[PDB]
Amino acid sequence: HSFEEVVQTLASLATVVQQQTIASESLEQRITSLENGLKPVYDMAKTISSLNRVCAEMVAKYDLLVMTTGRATATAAATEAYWAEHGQPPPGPSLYEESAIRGKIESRDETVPQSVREAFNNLDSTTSLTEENFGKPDISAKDLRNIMYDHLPGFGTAFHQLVQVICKLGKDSNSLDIIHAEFQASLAEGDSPQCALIQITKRVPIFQDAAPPVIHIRSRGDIPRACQKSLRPVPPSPKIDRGWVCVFQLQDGKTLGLKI
Amino acid sequence: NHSFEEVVQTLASLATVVQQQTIASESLEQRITSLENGLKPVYDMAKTISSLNRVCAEMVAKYDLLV
Amino acid sequence: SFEEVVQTLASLATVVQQQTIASESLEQRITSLENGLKPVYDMAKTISSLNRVCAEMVAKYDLLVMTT
Amino acid sequence: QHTQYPDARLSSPIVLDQCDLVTRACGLYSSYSLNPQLRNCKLPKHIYRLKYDVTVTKFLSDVPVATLPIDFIVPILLKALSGNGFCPVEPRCQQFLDEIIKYTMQDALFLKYYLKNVGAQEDCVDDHFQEKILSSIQGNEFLHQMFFWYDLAILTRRGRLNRGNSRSTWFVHDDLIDILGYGDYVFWKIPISLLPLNTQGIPHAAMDWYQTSVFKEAVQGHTHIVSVSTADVLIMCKDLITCRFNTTLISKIAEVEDPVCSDYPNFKIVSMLYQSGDYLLSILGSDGYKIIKFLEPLCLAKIQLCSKYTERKGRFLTQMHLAVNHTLEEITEIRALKPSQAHKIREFHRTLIRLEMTPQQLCELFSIQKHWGHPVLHSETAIQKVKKHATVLKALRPIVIFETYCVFKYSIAKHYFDSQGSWYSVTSDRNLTPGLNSYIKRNQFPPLPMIKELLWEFYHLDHPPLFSTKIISDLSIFIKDRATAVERTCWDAVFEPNVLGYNPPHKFSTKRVPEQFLEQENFSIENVLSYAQKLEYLLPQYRNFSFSLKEKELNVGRTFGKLPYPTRNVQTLCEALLADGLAKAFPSNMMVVTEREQKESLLHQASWHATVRGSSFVTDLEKYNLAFRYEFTAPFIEYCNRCYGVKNVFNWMHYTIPQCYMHVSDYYNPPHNLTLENRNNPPEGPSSYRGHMGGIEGLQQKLWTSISCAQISLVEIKTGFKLRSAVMGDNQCITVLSVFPLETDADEQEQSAEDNAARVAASLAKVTSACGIFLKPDETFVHSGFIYFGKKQYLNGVQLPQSLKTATRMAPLSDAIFDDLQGTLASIGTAFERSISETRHIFPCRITAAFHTFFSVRILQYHHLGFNKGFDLGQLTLGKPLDFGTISLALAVPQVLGGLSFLNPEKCFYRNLGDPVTSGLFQLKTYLRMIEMDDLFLPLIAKNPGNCTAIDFVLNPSGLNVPGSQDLTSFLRQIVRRTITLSAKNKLINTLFHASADFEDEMVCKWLLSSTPVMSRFAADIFSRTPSGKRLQILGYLEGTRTLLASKIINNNTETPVLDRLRKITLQRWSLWFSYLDHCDNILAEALTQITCTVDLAQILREYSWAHILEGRPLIGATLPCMIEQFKVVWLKPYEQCPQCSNAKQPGGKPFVSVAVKKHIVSAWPNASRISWTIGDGIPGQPAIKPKCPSAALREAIELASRLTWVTQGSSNSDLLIKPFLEARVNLSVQEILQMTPSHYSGNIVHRYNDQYSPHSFMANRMSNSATRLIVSTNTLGEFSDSNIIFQNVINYAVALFDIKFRNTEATDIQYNRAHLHLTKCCTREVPAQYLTYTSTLDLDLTRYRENELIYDNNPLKGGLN
Amino acid sequence: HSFEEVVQTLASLATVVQQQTIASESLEQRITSLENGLKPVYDMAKTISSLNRVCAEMVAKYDLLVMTTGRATATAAATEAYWAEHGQPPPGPSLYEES
RNA sequence: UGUGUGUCCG
Ligand SMILES: [Zn+2]
């Protein structure tokens, strides 16, 4: 009687217990899915710091950029229109790009204003500076000739002809820099400038085993009076290292040389 | 006989009930900890974005009266 | 006999009451999750607004710089 | 009588535009100015009647109508003007020549005697010493030309007076040359045979004015030609002659001292250089200065070539040679030079290149640049040069500007954090700077290596103001006796109406700073700040900004700016605020040489994240002013505004300058095409322009220097090297420390250091070019141990002598207020002291000074400009002619006793003396002992005390009450006060100068000296921090005779004229000297008799004077012994025992100080023969509460209270004595300041006021080369005989004595090793610890001071507390 | 004791059924909340990365600009400053570049 | 009659 009734009531209770278990596992799997979908919320918590860093950096940079430019920033369209007629740059500053402005400069079609051209050339010419070539001079034939002339006493001396032939050989051989450097070093170490010129004509490898130049001469009027003691008859096989500076040839097949 | 089996069945059902209750409590604790981890830090990120939005709005307001 | 039956019934009722109070506490703490809902809605706008601001910024950058 | 007083020295630019007027009046032809308006204008009332003068017509009766420029003739006049003519001056300057020589000889002898008395003397002296000096003086080349030029200068200076009608002319005929003068105009008549010719047959001077055919027709049969110039050329020539004579005399005399090798170049090479320069100028005209300007860089390169000669050491000389060759070839192409002239014109730089001299001789030769004259300036060329670089368009890189701004902010923050405790409480939403937050919370600062990624974070930092705008502690900056510009309303009223062609409608009233400062009704610092903050400088009447050409130089022209009065005040206030506000975060000094610093300290300083080798390079900042644009300097100006409370103050210049009209305010050439119709809107032409974008030199110099330092720091951060910067004059030197390991020898260290320096130079060039300022790589040079900077020259740690810059500027005549003899003698003495501070030869400078002193005395006695012609000062002031004996005696007693003596031999050892009175007494005693006139000491030192107040006592605490030792300052101050009485409606100065100011001054001065015992230095220190000091510093603003004789406000006070008072006071002063035995009493000599001690006699002399001030109270803290009297030397042999320390040192012994010589040589250039050429190893209390950014008044009250508390330590009146002084300065009451006063606890307050406070820095008067080779042991004194010994002076005396003793002998020839200085037991005393006691109180009402400025200020505690 | 046992079993069944219903309702609410993934998490996560990339690109591009100085910056700044305080155009005559 | 012909910032 009552035992059977308790039996089916407890059976129903057990069934509802299985639906309780079903509900429990359903909510557990829902919580697991929520956790799986929510796990990518603490990952922006880190990259937001990098976002803040880059945003603040950009804010500072562009705020300072707009601070320096007044109320006449002269948008690019206005500048391009202003360049066409009365090509002077527009009032107020303007903004370009390095590559774009270089490209416009290298093309002879846009007719970039002259002032902008020279300003950009001045700005750009200083980027080719390295450890060397900072204070390095540029040396030509005439400059080296004048530098050598300033160190010698008197005029018309055979040393002047020696300097001239040395600078000519350096010019057509393209070795002036090393000659000047070692000449300056020799002049610094203490010897006489004539001894220095001897060092140039004896030490430079290019000057080794060289024949002196032949110069056509009219008469004794052309040759300076200070070198008449240095005229000598030419022997066969002249050599610069032997003491040859030049060869003078007359009209009537006369050849003479100078001895140092 | 029948009474003992019914008692055993009820005991097993109650054991399962308390086991799932403990599991639910553990899940509650873990989600409470997860929420606590996302309570103060999320406020910190919120105020940081507030500041960034304010400064960016100031910048664009400055830029607006230029074009 | 009957004493064991009534004792186990009382134990069943007590455990049922414990389960019910645990369930209502679980529901009360689940419905307390709306705190996590404050940094969901409003914050979204901020990010979106920030995006919009950045977007227009880029546009303005193209109106001033001569570029290519 | 007159309101004119022409100067005796050249101090103005040379412009010859007005001469075109004179040639039009006489009928000649000349073209000096480029303004055509001067061709057909109207002559003034004067220089028009020149056609009515018989003398001018007679002079110009046999000369062609054509003339020549004067800049082609100056060398010709210099070479061909000896003294042989007939000058109108009656007493010729050559008449009193021999006497001068005699005096010179005497002085030399005295010096020798003095040295022989000290113990220095010389080893192996030569008997033939005076004869060589006499021959050298008599054998000078420029001896007679100097006297002739001085006669000419006297004539032209006298003739420039008589501004009224009926002017006269003077005439001089010197053999070949004829000179005529008429009111600041000179006509020179010269033969034509002396002018170099052209290939076309005309002189080189006439090429630019005439064609070949016209000039030949104009000349025809004539032998003389006439040139016209102003009176400034004559003064320039006189200065050139004096400089050449001084240089030649010094060079000749120096050879006698050291025949084998002297430090001066030569006496014959310099003559060749002078001749070469003169020839080059005579050929090339005024353009030869472009070549003369290369003397300094060539000498620098030649000095640069005295080292190991690395591969790049010769680059500078090569660049200079190329530049000079290019310029020489460029500036002569048009001129038709003959081949002979072409070869002979290069001799100048040919000689300069080929020189072979020691570096010291080259450094001495470096200082003769201005011995050839100065060019002729034009307005148009200067305007063209300024217009370029100022309207040019620049390109900028924003990233470099951003980094520079960040470095600026970082430097300011770091400087604030280093002092003042901790961070500055950054506001503004801290999360925007993530990375700096940890440092702020931990309260630390980033070191340096890690500040490279957070640099941008410094942009967001915000703060309240860090500095205050009420810290002006000196009121003399607002009144300085200068000139300003005029209002825009009457901008054209500064030009001559006759040249302009129209009378200006509106005229100005005054043009001087003092004549406008006193008439500003509402002057105040807060008023100035309000005026600046309201942008009130943009008003239509406040935009003039005139230009002005600079003084003597060698450029084509440099200009400075002049502003109206209120903008000038704003500029002065901004500079004052920046001097002591910002710019302390960017120090520009240091001057540290790695060869004279400790090894470990250098290593620690050079560490960024082992021997340290440093290099350096120098750059020039003079063109930076015109290269600054608003787009680059805007953020820095905004930050400077924000750091203070101001809004739009620091950007006045960038706001008001481009709106101005640029022109040069020259009296005789207004802007081109100026007419009455276009007066309100004048056009721009060759001498004017409108758009100016760059800066101006001088204005805002501190901000620009700060920006440069920020750029250097940015470069230092960018590249991992340690950089130090120094800025002075127009140059900045930057040194780089490289730090090297131990095992790297010493050969590649120099190469690596120079490589690092080149890297730094290239990076800095790139950065600065990106900022818009371009460096020139062809002039910047890199070296590894040679540094030249302002007044210092060092070569690998060895100081090079450079003393010709000051020794050659000595002159008998100088502007010293009404040609005062005392001022001239004082200037000569200071110049001699400064010159002897350098070099290693003593005799030449003293000989030159002695030569010039007597000449100045004679020329002032016979040719004073303040009186009429024929007036003799030395006759009527005495009744008899003044003789050599009286002058020689009156040039020997020192000035502290009133005796016109300033060449103290004691100064040869050290600069600042402990007690002038004792030193003067010793000098007089020694001089009187040298001659056999010993029985005159008492009558000479007795004198008669004068009448003086307590103010005079507190002005000079170490003085005496004799009328002969006073200056003209009191007279000028009385005149200024009298002028203020009937003027100065300023309404704020009037409050300060109330009716009873003088009585209050007297009461305060008397109260300060009522202590017991009386101390004068403490009273003088306290007196400067009261309103009395402010009144005194405002009163003393007069500086020149012209403003004294020409001021409208001063000369409109009726009463007796200033000239008569000046003549009377000059006569009285001249009567005071040279008289003798007329102003002495016979009551003090008995008291001074039988003393035989300088200290006691000086104390008695001081006590006898000021008798009416100090009744019977003792006087302390004013007397100190002479250093020579205290110590005696023995010159111990290396193997010898001291007689003093052994023979007579048995019972107790005598303390002494020891000097020993080192042996390590380190470095030497060029040799180690001389001691001066080598160097050696060996280096030569908190308050409870500190306020933040205190005002000037608060600070001054703080130290005043601290001093009063500390001096009266044993008394209980300190709570009441302080209050009356603080009631007029600060709003805080007593017992509130006391917690801010730092605690002091010491004794013997005399020593605190002597050295610890350091009123003088002492220092030495010799080169520091020898000091590194000696070691001084002072602990041997033991109980120190806490005493009267000043240790710094002892060290200086020992070093100087050793240096002078061995200055010509070789290093090996030195036979002495150790030196003992034994102290005598006569002039050394013991000082006790004494505290002043005041028995009364001031009880004076100082509460009436409730005004602005340095006076009582409200709410002083506004900056907060720490 | 049969009636009281039946009543107790029925009450227990009703209570457990109510528990099942409320658990199902909570599950449905959680599923509804998770339907959109709370909504903004994914697209704001993508937007954060996109914004980071854009800002980095802009910062990198900022290092390649060249500025040309104008001849009217000072006048414009002065006019703006004079308008900011006591707003009124500066007094005549006109400045260097009135534009 | 030629306003003090000029002589500034450090
Ligand atoms: Zn001894």
UniProtKB/TrEMBL annotation, chain B:
It is found in: Virion; Host cytoplasm. Homooligomer. Belongs to the filoviridae polymerase cofactor VP35 family. Plays an essential role in viral RNA synthesis and also a role in suppressing innate immune signaling. This is Polymerase cofactor VP35. It comes from Ebola virus. The lineage of its organism: Viruses, Riboviria, Orthornavirae, Negarnaviricota, Haploviricotina. The gene is VP35.
From TrEMBL, chain D:
One of its GO terms (molecular function) is GTPase activity. Transmembrane segments: none annotated. The keyword Cell division does not apply. The keyword Nucleotidyltransferase applies. Residues 613-797 form the RdRp catalytic domain. GO terms for cellular component: host cell cytoplasm; virion component. Its EC number is 2.7.7.48, 3.6.1.-, 2.7.7.88, 2.1.1.-. Zn(2+) binds at C1138, C1141, H1316, H1318. It catalyses: a 5'-end (5'-triphosphoguanosine)-adenylyl-adenylyl-cytidylyl-adenosine in mRNA + 2 S-adenosyl-L-methionine = a 5'-end (N(7)-methyl 5'-triphosphoguanosine)-(2'-O-methyladenylyl)-adenylyl-cytidylyl-adenosine in mRNA + 2 S-adenosyl-L-homocysteine + H(+); GTP + H2O = GDP + phosphate + H(+); a 5'-end triphospho-adenylyl-adenylyl-cytidylyl-adenosine in mRNA + GDP + H(+) = a 5'-end (5'-triphosphoguanosine)-adenylyl-adenylyl-cytidylyl-adenosine in mRNA + diphosphate; RNA(n) + a ribonucleoside 5'-triphosphate = RNA(n+1) + diphosphate. It comes from the Viruses. Keywords: ATP-binding, Coiled coil, Host cytoplasm, Hydrolase, Metal-binding, Methyltransferase, mRNA capping, mRNA processing, Multifunctional enzyme, Nucleotide-binding, Nucleotidyltransferase, RNA-directed RNA polymerase, S-adenosyl-L-methionine, Transferase, Viral RNA replication, Virion, Zinc. It is found in: Virion; Host cytoplasm. RNA-directed RNA polymerase that catalyzes the replication of viral genomic RNA. The template is composed of the viral RNA tightly encapsidated by the nucleoprotein (N). The replicase mode is dependent on intracellular N protein concentration. In this mode, the polymerase replicates the whole viral genome without recognizing transcriptional signals, and the replicated genome is not caped or polyadenylated. This is RNA-directed RNA polymerase L. The lineage of its organism: Viruses, Riboviria, Orthornavirae, Negarnaviricota, Haploviricotina. The gene is L.
